[PDB]
Amino acid sequence: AKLTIESTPFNVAEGKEVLLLVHNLPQHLFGYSWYKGERCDGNRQIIGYVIGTQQATPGPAYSGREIIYPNASLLIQNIIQNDAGFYTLHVIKSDLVNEEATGQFRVYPEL
């Protein structure tokens, strides 16, 4: 029912990768908008994807490391400390009363 992001691992070692799994996508979709952070700050949008045409456009915050998947999940590679924090997904429904959810993960150094 409720849209949820679960990061996996919740704790990502430096240089490895996180996957943000998306659960309970609503019906009547259109595409997805993924932001680093907690609000919809377009200046820190990673990516947007149109379900209908499988078209994936980078945003100001995209950095060469992020991958998006048809069912909204988003993986981020070769992680660094500054990646730790919140990530908010915005699922744009076709009638534009959209839904949003945010997840986080943490990063840590090995020794």
Next chain:
Amino acid sequence: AKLTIESTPFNVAEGKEVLLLVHNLPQHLFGYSWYKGERCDGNRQIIGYVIGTQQATPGPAYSGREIIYPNASLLIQNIIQNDAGFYTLHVIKSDLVNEEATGQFRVYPEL
């Protein structure tokens, strides 16, 4: 150039109405999402509108008083104190790297 909301009046007397004018809409649009507040909290979405089909759907926060206009402006009638605050617009571009902007207004009692 930069997307901006200007409220008018910035100071709305109780029972009167505010109009949130939208300036410098970007190109390649699709529709608009209007939220009470500063972030994209779907639980306080007022309304969404699809430019292509002139279709306007209410959100959880819609309250019977809000009107949306083809070029994104949004008026709110018979204003009360609790309306004062921020309002964020989210312009959903067709490739889903969207833009956002927020405006405010203030409300005040006459005597």
